């Protein structure tokens, strides 16, 4: 086995085709299924894995009560083959209430953050053993992507943030080789708040589309030079911004150096990736809540902040159905690197009071050069009967 280099081109994306769906919540009404949130998908060279941050309990479990709390010492990184629901045999790969993972072509890197809010510890588990750890540098919720890291030529890059949830924070880009932190780069450029980055290999570098929880409804971009460890940051130009909350399409504006200051506070983990000057991006259909999910290409959306020309729209989750975090992951094809994305389908508290617990299902779509129709793939759990 040789390190991944992702040295193939990004082949044409005409849109996205259905790939996987865990149906976790529906199954949990009739089985022992983990309570989860912050899911993501990452693939070793042969097959894809679904990850999630468990709450240390199953849904049909007295402990599933009050699972809205996002940081407990019982949260662990769940790891299954993609499409295997988080059943009781699910391997907990580390203790974490925030995590990221990539496969470098030889082994799995898991970056796992747990411990006290203001005193968190990030453990770096590579090939099944703890190789390194770093303490919170800003002592305010050290946190990472909640999606796959990007691992090029055995050098793994993970974006980690520490500091104000909705103010200036200290973001660093760690470069990990076989679990060892060999270099740490401070966030550089014009991105003013960076959280929950959705990163993909863009050879020779790594590109991250992240969450600005402070001032932008446009998503910050972080470009990572894996060779010299240089960092540059910006925002997605697209006038059709991808964050939630955001202003309506008619009244929304973007700026690919600065946050747009349009309903900038709060946000959601999302993703975008460039296709020449265009941008493929997903976002909740609802502009203020995490309801529905859509993906589309914005013509010139990667370079022209005034561009609101949308095309290739696909509804992934109907606007009446609950979306959540979404993130990118990349899959090496025969001759090209495909872009795929997952959507967290959040159900339960606080929004849904029919149940006491907070969990999610996932739906996974992959870029296609072929053709596709239309549909909607929500969670589909009828919480009234649960």
């Amino acid at each position: 086995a040789e390190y991944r280099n992702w040295s193939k081109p990004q082949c044409g994306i005409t849109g996205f085709a259905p790939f996987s769906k865990d149906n976790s919540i529906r199954l949990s009404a009739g089985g022992d299924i983990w309570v989860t949130r912050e899911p993501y998908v990452s693939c070793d060279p042969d097959k894809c894995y679904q990850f999630a941050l468990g709450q240390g309990t199953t849904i049909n479990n007295v402990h599933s009560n009050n699972t809205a709390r996002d940081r407990t010492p019982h949260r662990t990184l769940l790891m299954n083959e993609l499409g295997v629901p988080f059943h009781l045999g699910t391997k907990q790969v580390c203790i974490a209430w925030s995590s990221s993972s990539c496969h470098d072509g030889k082994a799995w890197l898991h970056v796992c953050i747990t411990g006290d809010d203001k005193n968190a510890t990030a453990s770096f588990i590579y090939n099944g053993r703890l190789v390194d750890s770093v303490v919170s540098w800003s002592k305010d919720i050290l946190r990472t992507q909640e999606s796959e890291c990007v691992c090029i030529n055995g050098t793994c890059t993970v974006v980690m943030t520490d500091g104000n949830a909705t103010g200036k924070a200290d973001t660093k880009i760690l470069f990990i080789e076989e679990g060892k932190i060999v270099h740490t780069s401070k966030l550089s450029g014009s991105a003013q708040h960076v959280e929950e980055c959705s990163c993909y290999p863009r050879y020779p570098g790594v590109r991250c589309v992240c969450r600005d929880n402070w001032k932008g409804s446009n998503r910050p971009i972080v470009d990572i030079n894996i060779k010299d460890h240089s960092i540059v940051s910006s925002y997605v130009c697209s006038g059709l911004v991808g964050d939630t909350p955001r202003k309506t399409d008619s009244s929304s504006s973007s700026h690919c150096l600065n946050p747009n200051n349009e309903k900038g506070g709060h946000g959601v983990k999302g993703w975008a990736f460039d296709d020449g000057n265009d941008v493929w991006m997903g976002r909740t259909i609802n502009e203020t809540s995490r309801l529905g999910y859509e993906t589309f290409k914005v013509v010139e959306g990667w370079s022209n902040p005034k561009s609101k020309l949308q095309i290739n729209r696909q509804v992934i989750v109907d606007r009446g159905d609950r979306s959540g975090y979404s993130g990118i992951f990349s899959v090496e094809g025969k001759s090209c690197i495909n872009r795929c994305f997952y959507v967290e389908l959040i159900r339960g508290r606080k929004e849904e009071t029919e149940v006491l617990w907070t969990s999610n299902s996932i739906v996974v779509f992959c870029g296609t050069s072929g053709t596709y129709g239309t549909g909607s793939w929500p969670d589909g759990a009828d919480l009234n009967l649960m």
């Epitope: 912050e38 809010d117 203001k118 946190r143 104000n164 949830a165 909705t166 959280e195 975090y325």
Partner: nanobody
Framework: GRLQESGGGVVQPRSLTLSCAAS????????MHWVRQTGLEWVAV????????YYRDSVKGRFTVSRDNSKNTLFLQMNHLRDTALYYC????????????????????????????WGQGTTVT
């Protein structure tokens, strides 16, 4: 981080301006509270930007809390003093942003800091 209240003294049943100087940290970084002890009794709070305030009901319309983030100084303008207590200046414990300003408690990664730094307090009688 250290806070140092000042301006306390003997006031006739009149006005008195309390000052709180911050050293070792920038006042703009923190919600600032005034807490008096006659137990502990929250008096008023000043937002980080200095544009929003809340007051205890019994002091509303009498006490004015302000700050100068450039000077790292928090102020409590006390008027129509009836209020005898040791007045503490404390940082942290943001209110809920959903009520107009403060922390986004509904975000995925909510954070909270208590009143982790207090001044020694200035006596007002």
């Amino acid at each position: 981080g250290r806070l140092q209240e000042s301006g306390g003294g003997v006031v006739q049943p009149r006005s008195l301006t309390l000052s709180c100087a911050a050293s070792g940290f920038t006042l703009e970084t923190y919600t600032m509270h005034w807490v008096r002890q006659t137990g502990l009794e929250w008096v008023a709070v000043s937002s980080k930007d200095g544009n929003n305030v809340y007051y205890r009901d019994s002091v509303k319309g009498r006490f004015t809390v302000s700050r100068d983030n450039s000077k790292n100084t928090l102020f409590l303008q006390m008027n129509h003093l009836r209020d005898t207590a040791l007045y503490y200046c404390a940082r942290g414990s943001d209110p809920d942003y959903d009520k107009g300003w403060g922390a986004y408690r509904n975000t995925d990664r909510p954070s909270y800091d208590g009143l982790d730094v207090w001044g020694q307090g200035t006596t007002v009688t």
